């Protein structure tokens, strides 16, 4: 109904700003942002769908239309929204519709969900610059941010915790070690 269709009424920490990005399986996407200087908090969850308080099992069915996203809290004085957008372009292929890698489904779609008109404009202009670099058309959706449902704790900072195989991937700021999808 309208609850999940409502806005994100959560307030970030003082002096911080919220940002939301969808770029496929949220594990790798979260790790990418954890390494960005200026990012003070990261968390994965579900949003843009039609089901209130969804579980991972619900989203997995692909019938909720929710997208797996990372909600980022960043300090605008230390990290610009543009820098975050650049991280997005470098973390995934923004030209595949409703899929990322071998993860197929609407819950893996590319998207930038803005909290302000400033973010919307920045996202649209950044997409134009990025597009001139890619052959395929960018399908990333730029829409207003909506209610964010934080995912189960076992999904949070999953790769840094060890991933599927036990090999922890570092979340230290400035780390450029290639991010591996599931572990």
UniProtKB/TrEMBL annotation:
GO terms for biological process: cellular response to oxidative stress. It comes from the Eukaryota. GO terms for cellular component: cytoplasm. Transmembrane segments: none annotated. Its EC number is 1.8.4.11. Residues 19-161 form the Peptide methionine sulphoxide reductase MsrA domain. It catalyses: [thioredoxin]-disulfide + L-methionine + H2O = L-methionine (S)-S-oxide + [thioredoxin]-dithiol; L-methionyl-[protein] + [thioredoxin]-disulfide + H2O = L-methionyl-(S)-S-oxide-[protein] + [thioredoxin]-dithiol. Keywords: Oxidoreductase. GO terms for molecular function: peptide-methionine (S)-S-oxide reductase activity. Belongs to the MsrA Met sulfoxide reductase family. This is peptide-methionine (S)-S-oxide reductase. It comes from Populus trichocarpa x Populus deltoides.
């Amino acid at each position: 109904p309208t609850i999940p269709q409502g806005p994100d009424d959560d307030l970030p920490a003082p002096g911080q700003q919220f940002a939301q990005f969808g770029a496929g399986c949220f594990w790798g996407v979260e790790l990418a942002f954890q390494r960005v200087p200026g990012v003070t908090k990261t968390e994965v969850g579900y949003t843009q769908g039609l089901l209130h308080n969804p579980t991972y099992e619900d989203v997995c069915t692909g019938t909720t239309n929710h997208n797996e996203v990372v909600r980022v809290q960043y300090d605008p004085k230390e990290c610009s929204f543009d820098t975050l957008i650049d991280v997005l372009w470098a973390r995934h292929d923004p030209t595949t519709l409703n899929r990322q890698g071998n993860d197929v489904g609407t819950q893996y779609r590319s998207g930038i969900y803005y909290y302000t008109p400033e973010q919307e404009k920045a996202a649209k202009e950044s997409l134009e610059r990025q597009q001139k670099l890619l052959n395929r058309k960018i399908v990333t959706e730029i829409l207003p941010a909506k209610k964010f449902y934080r995912a189960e704790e076992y999904h949070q900072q999953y790769l840094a915790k060890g991933g599927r195989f036990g090999f922890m991937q570092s979340a230290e700021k400035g780390c450029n070690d290639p991010i591996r999808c599931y572990g």
